[PDB]
């Protein structure tokens with residue numbers, strides 16, 4: 203039936219015409235028309251009068267920023283911040299990412315959040331931070347995610363001298379996490395320890411999917427210290443595997459392989475990786491660890507990971523007496539976080555602390571790029 | 580928390596709700612229609628939104644009810660903003676009457692709100708006295724209302740083919756009285772009761788149609804040939820519909836309207852002067868009870884029959900008969916039962932476009948029609 207086919211489209215949570223997206227369309231239409239200049243048009247003024255009471259009722263019922271208490275700012279980004287929040291009714295703690303609609307439109311970057319929201323909402327993977335809710339108001343997009351109290355791998359590296367047994371565990375967990383992202387047809391493009399978070403048990407999850415891109419049928423897609431040579435000079439999955447080599451080097455050596463005083467010096471060192479990569483003589487690194495770093499830090503054509511993840515899995519570096527690839531996330535992590543409460547943000551450094559869209563004379567549609575963002579798990 | 584999500588889901592499930600799924604799909608369709616113009620697509624916000632919703636909106640347009648699902652058999656009615664066609668649904672092969680309303684003419688002639696009560700009365704009355712609406716759909720040019728076809732025609736047609744005896748006039752007046760009481764009970768005043776809007780079903784029984792003038796009454800009960808004097812001298816009560824019933828009973832029995840004149844102004848002058856202009860011709864075959872009932876309706880609003888409710892009308896001596904009771908009249912044999920040769924026989928009906936300009940900026944011509952779609 204045509205009515206059955208149409209009702210199936212609205213029930214689908216991945217559908218652009220689900221009830222949440224249809225409510226976004228109505229909310230956005232009201233937001234973009236409720237201006238004194240536009241209200242001079244009888245069509246616009248009468249429509250706003252008809253939908254005024256129901257839209258105000260809907261606004262009070264739907265999820266909003268006022269349903270959460272902001273505890274602390276635990277992160278900052280180009281377009282907003284990440285807050286540690288507590289839901290006022292349920293008393294449950296989450297991490298909430300905010301994205302400024304004004305900054306996203308002004309800096310012509312207003313489409314990256316679709317894949318970010320979808321990866322977190324629909325991955326169903328223990329390696330990806332879960333999104334519970336996605337909602338919005340006139341100024342921001344909000345993403346309510348699981349809070350990772352263990353902090354990131356930048357914080358871990360600065361508080362510990364990482365032994366090779368630990369480095370082996372974290373690299374293996376990054377490998378499985380990137381294999382999960384790659385299996386969903388995506389390339390991360392920003393693999394760095396700042397985006398590798400640890401949960402309450404010390405296990406890894408990836409976060410910040412703002413650079414993720416869906417790869418085409420060929421498996422292709424059209425940060426200075428972690429950027430690969432091919433992006434500096436049309437990239438595939440092995441672009442993410444470069445960053446894993448840089449990460450394993452930073453963990454074992456204590457410094458980045460292509461560190462330099464200037465940004466141009468660092469770029470020059472990455473282009474010259476065939477001669478600029480060298481392990482310090484004091485370095486306490488095994489032959490297998492140097493071999494694995496070197497297999498990742500090569501030109502894209504011969505790089506480890508180009509032919510999937512099976513070649514990475516069988517590398518001799520990963521041989522150990524604690525875990526297997528099928529059970530690594532259910533074994534004891536090297537560092538188990540010592541938390542004093544559900545809002546303990548001691549594994550996060552303190553963050554140091556406004557503009558709106560101009561009132562329009564004619565219809566501009568600033569809310570239109572955000573229709574369909576709302577999602578409730 | 581979950582109470583908020585329950586309250587919100589109840590609002591969308593409600594078929595009377597302005598935010599039901601049909602209304603939410605109208606909002607998306609209208610937004611796409613009002614933005615898909617080359618001039619507006621210069622704006623990146625508009626162009627990118629239309630690119631995102633292009634495939635899904637085309638899919639929705641093919642699945643949703645459209646004029647192409649019906650075969651037009653004949654035009655059986657005409658009106659200010661459109662026409663009523665006798666149509667056949669292509670898939671089910673079922674016959675309906677479909678009223679069309681031009682969005683362009685309704686906007687141009689600043690009359691774009693009357694259809695809300697009309698659609699609601701027909702969709703939700705659940706009364707044998709009101710024409711039933713099955714579907715309400717719309718495209719870029721028209722609003723459509725798919726209703727049950729009344730093959731018996733209207734009472735204008737009945738009056739021109741028959742010399743109506745008083746026993747028949749009693750039956751049709753009693754059915755109009757019950758039909759009006761049903762509308763009054765729903766909190767509405769018709770304001771245009773006339774035999775053109777009184778239709779007969781396949782069995783010869785009455786149903787009212789054309790609810791374009793209906794208005795919801797306040798807590799106080801307040802809001803040419805058939806209009807009351809108080810309506811002409813312009814707040815109206817339900818007794819302005821009872822005036823129309825007196826005019827109808829007079830036309831049925833006498834053969835002419837009580838305030839007929841060659842011109843519209845002549846008719847208006849006669850209605851204002853009803854105290855002296857109303858007179859029964861000496862050759863009119865009418866009883867004393869029939870004249871008394873017509874006179875009780877054709878008075879000033881203050882003393883008019885039906886002002887204090889329908890009970891006073893029901894107990895009038897004119898309605899005394901040995902054929903029906905008020906509780907069963909619609910289940911007794913009608914005076915004239917239609918003889919139809921097929922499901923598209925329209926023998927009881929006499930035989931019977933400017934578009935919006937392409938805009939340079941957002942005008943929102945589809946906005947007044949959001950929420951019209953309804954599927955029974």
Ligand SMILES: COc1cccc(CNC(=O)c2ccc3c(c2)OCc2cnccc2-3)c1
Pocket residue numbers: 276277278279280281282283284297299300301331347348349350351399409410411412
């Ligand atoms: C482009 O505009 C922005 C705006 C705001 C932040 C970012 C980058 N930062 C992030 O995206 C980010 C950072 C930390 C977390 C996170 C995401 O989600 C999971 C999570 C759980 N527990 C603790 C922390 C996190 C980018």
Ligand SMILES: COc1cccc(CNC(=O)c2ccc3c(c2)OCc2cnccc2-3)c1
Pocket residue numbers: 655656657658659660661662663676678679680710726727728729730778788789790791
């Ligand atoms: C103000 O713009 C318009 C536009 C079009 C028509 C009218 C007046 N006409 C009507 O509203 C109307 C309503 C229902 C029926 C009808 C006419 O005649 C035939 C018929 C047969 N079977 C069932 C129902 C009907 C007014």
Ligand SMILES: [Cl-]
Pocket residue numbers: 898899900903904905
């Ligand atoms: Cl009786």
